[PDB]
């Protein structure tokens, strides 16, 4: 068992998918336990009705703490789950970033640069910078669709972040500039990318 | 405009299909409604950073006003989106549990009561009061999870509804116990389909 713990998700299955089964299973999970005392509580109630009516109320909050218990638990594994999601969704954000990055500077420092490759690389850069830009809005959006309060207090950092990253994209096109000849022949492609 | 409304979405989408593409389109919208907003505000900053103080506040407090207009549109927005949904999953439950109970009556009451039909009529019917009961459940499960102190305040409706379910279960059985043959030949199957 420690060992499938060592292994984790295979490779072939992405973080959302796993994510996505990791919180369906706990679902279904607690479902299954939350019909279970619920189950109990109504058979309780049946054979409650000949008695004290002080056994009674007893027995309701029984019930009541059982759910009260499982309630907290729900919340505190869901908030566990949501925890490593995100910061494994950002981490693999930063991760395709700085690989992207990596691919277009060694597409520009190849003896002889390579127009279309070069092309290529800078595409895959700008598109992993969108998704970091996408994720920020995203988020932020969605804080707001569920909780105002808290979208208030983003503002600012949004506002931020979005500027970093578009301060980053202007800083990596400059490593263009280094090579006058080639940011000729490009001029026009990458005037279409901007877009 | 008025008239794609009421013809409404087309057969071929589905409530739960239509649901997520609708709050797709709008999360889009919403982002690049924020987006345009948040480079008209860094754009204001660099022009201001020479301005009286006051001037700089009010610059501010101009876009801080304009994403507060926008959070609550995109608030209300999803609150509606949600509310619609909710109200069609719950009509659909309701539309099958009445569906299956009409075919479950229809069977009990022919001429010569085929416990063939019988049965698969009170099958369906279960498999309706099921569902209402697992959307039952997971409701409950789902506010827990993101909000745990409206899930204490339901907490005693979903049992009492859970209840009102299993009742009405017991109250359709009670129809077959007005075939005493029938029951008694269709009990061992019946009891594999409530024991499910
Ligand atoms: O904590 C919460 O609030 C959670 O709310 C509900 O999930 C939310 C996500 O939290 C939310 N993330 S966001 O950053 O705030 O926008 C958002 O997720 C969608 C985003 O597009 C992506 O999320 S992200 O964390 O990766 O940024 C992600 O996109 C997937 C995409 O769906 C996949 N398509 S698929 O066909 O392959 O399945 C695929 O393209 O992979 C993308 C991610 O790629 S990645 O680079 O690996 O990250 O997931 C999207 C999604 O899940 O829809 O929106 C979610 C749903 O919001 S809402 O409509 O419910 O309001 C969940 O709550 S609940 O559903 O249990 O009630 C839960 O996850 C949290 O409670």
């Given at each position: 068992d420690g060992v499938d713990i060592y292994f984790?998700?295979?490779?072939?299955?992405s973080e959302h998918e796993g994510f996505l089964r990791a919180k369906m299973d706990l679902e279904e999970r607690r479902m299954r336990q939350i019909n279970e005392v619920m189950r109990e509580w109504a058979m309780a109630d049946n054979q409650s009705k000949n008695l004290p009516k002080a056994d009674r109320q007893a027995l309701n909050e029984h019930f009541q703490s059982i759910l009260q218990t499982l309630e907290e638990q729900v919340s505190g594994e869901r908030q566990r789950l949501v925890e490593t999601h995100a910061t494994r969704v950002i981490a693999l954000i930063n991760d395709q970033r700085r690989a992207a990055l990596e691919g277009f500077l060694a597409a520009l420092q190849a003896?002889?640069?390579q127009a279309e490759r070069v092309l290529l690389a800078l595409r895959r850069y700008l598109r992993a910078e969108q998704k970091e830009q996408r994720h920020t809005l995203r988020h932020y959006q969605h804080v707001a669709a569920v909780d105002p309060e808290k979208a208030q207090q983003m503002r600012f950092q949004v506002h931020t972040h979005l500027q970093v990253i578009e301060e980053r994209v202007n800083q990596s096109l400059?490593?263009?500039?280094?090579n006058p000849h080639l940011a000729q022949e490009l001029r026009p492609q990458i005037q279409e990318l901007l877009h």
């Amino acid at each position: 068992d420690g060992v499938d713990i060592y292994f984790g998700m295979p490779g072939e299955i992405s973080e959302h998918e796993g994510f996505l089964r990791a919180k369906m299973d706990l679902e279904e999970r607690r479902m299954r336990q939350i019909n279970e005392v619920m189950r109990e509580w109504a058979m309780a109630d049946n054979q409650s009705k000949n008695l004290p009516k002080a056994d009674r109320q007893a027995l309701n909050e029984h019930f009541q703490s059982i759910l009260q218990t499982l309630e907290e638990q729900v919340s505190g594994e869901r908030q566990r789950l949501v925890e490593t999601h995100a910061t494994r969704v950002i981490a693999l954000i930063n991760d395709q970033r700085r690989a992207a990055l990596e691919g277009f500077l060694a597409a520009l420092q190849a003896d002889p640069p390579q127009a279309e490759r070069v092309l290529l690389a800078l595409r895959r850069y700008l598109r992993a910078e969108q998704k970091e830009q996408r994720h920020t809005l995203r988020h932020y959006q969605h804080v707001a669709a569920v909780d105002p309060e808290k979208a208030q207090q983003m503002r600012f950092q949004v506002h931020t972040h979005l500027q970093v990253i578009e301060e980053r994209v202007n800083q990596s096109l400059g490593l263009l500039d280094q090579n006058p000849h080639l940011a000729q022949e490009l001029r026009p492609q990458i005037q279409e990318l901007l877009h």
